[PDB]
Amino acid sequence: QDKTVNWKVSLWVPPAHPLVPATKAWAEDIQKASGGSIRMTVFPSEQLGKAFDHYDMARDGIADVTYVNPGYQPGRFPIVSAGQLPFVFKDGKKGTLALNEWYHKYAPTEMKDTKLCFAFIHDPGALHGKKKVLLPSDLSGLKVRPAQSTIGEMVKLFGGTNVQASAPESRDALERGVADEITFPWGSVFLFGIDKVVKYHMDVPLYTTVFTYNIGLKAYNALSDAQKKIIDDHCTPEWASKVTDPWTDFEANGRVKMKALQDHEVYPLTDAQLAEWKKATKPLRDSWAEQVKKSGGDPAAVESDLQNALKKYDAGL
Numbered sequence: 001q002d003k004t005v006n007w008k009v010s011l012w013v014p015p016a017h018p019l020v021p022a023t024k025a026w027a028e029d030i031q032k033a034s035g036g037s038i039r040m041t042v043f044p045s046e047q048l049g050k051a052f053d054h055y056d057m058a059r060d061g062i063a064d065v066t067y068v069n070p071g072y073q074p075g076r077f078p079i080v081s082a083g084q085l086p087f088v089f090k091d092g093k094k095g096t097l098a099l100n101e102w103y104h105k106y107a108p109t110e111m112k113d114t115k116l117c118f119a120f121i122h123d124p125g126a127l128h129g130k131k132k133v134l135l136p137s138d139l140s141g142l143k144v145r146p147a148q149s150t151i152g153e154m155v156k157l158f159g160g161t162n163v164q165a166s167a168p169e170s171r172d173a174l175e176r177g178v179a180d181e182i183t184f185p186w187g188s189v190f191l192f193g194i195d196k197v198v199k200y201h202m203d204v205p206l207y208t209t210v211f212t213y214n215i216g217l218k219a220y221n222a223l224s225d226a227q228k229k230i231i232d233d234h235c236t237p238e239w240a241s242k243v244t245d246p247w248t249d250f251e252a253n254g255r256v257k258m259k260a261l262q263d264h265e266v267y268p269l270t271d272a273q274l275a276e277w278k279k280a281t282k283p284l285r286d287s288w289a290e291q292v293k294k295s296g297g298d299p300a301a302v303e304s305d306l307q308n309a310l311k312k313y314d315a316g317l
């Protein structure tokens with residue numbers, strides 16, 4: 001038998017979040033593959049550290065595996081931020097596979113101080129809140145809790161202000177009144193109790209959040225070659241889908257559930273209103289491209305690679 005391995009996996013979502021049982025099942029299959037030599041415990045609810053610090057927790061050995069939202073740290077990961085632009089993805093499952101295939105090309109530039117396991121997205125989210133927002137300018141003067149740095153840029157472009165908060169901190173920000181509006185996926189509105197705090201919901205696949213699962217290099221490099229192979233075999237597109245597809249399904253189910261509640265107003269946009277949003281969100285691409293160039297990348301090449309992946313997987317809106 002190999003030297004026994006005991007890993008800690010850190011998440012910043014609660015136990016009822018679909019990623020938690022799915023990640024336990026991933027760990028269980030690794031234990032089965034390794035004949036017991038690799039064991040893990042999954043720590044939800046920020047027990048091991050705050051949401052925003054999860055990349056550094058993997059980098060620095062606080063946890064062996066972490067769930068990361070790169071977009072909680074503005075400017076840190078300019079390439080992966082291409083997936084954060086409004087109106088990119090139509091579907092969580094195919095979008096996860098497209099993002100993962102594309103980003104594995106660039107993760108060695110941008111995430112070289114961890115091992116990237118896989119990248120993924122959520123089912124496209126929506127704008128939820130206390131006001132019936134139809135056009136970009138309706139965010140002017142509103143306080144918005146953005147999902148990631150690109151949505152934060154969008155809020156400022158439209159004359160709102162941001163409320164920086166992680167998913168588990170968002171209900172409290174809305175309840176205290178410091179946020180009027182939130183970009184969130186639909187099932188998570190229920191999971192975090194936000195359905196009791198906001199009643200308006202714009203029925204548009206506005207954006208998604210990009211995520212990574214990151215493994216510490218010291219943790220990985222302490223494995224035997226047989227153990228490394230088992231981890232690598234659990235970091236493939238197959239496993240990106242197995243871990244994240246239940247989350248996609250949960251979030252899409254949330255939208256259908258919300259649309260049946262008589263105390264909520266889930267409203268469509270007109271073609272004219274949606275075009276103002278598509279047209280109005282376009283400047284975010286130049287901001288993205290400038291950040292990539294400043295960090296030493298070629299945004300035209302990075303963007304064409306992502307567009308090719310979207311087309312391959314039929315993942316693009």
Ligand SMILES: O=C(O)Cc1ccc(O)cc1
Pocket residue numbers: 013017069146147148165166167183184185188209
């Ligand atoms: O909007 C975010 O903060 C990202 C996110 C939202 C809901 C969720 O369940 C997980 C992450």
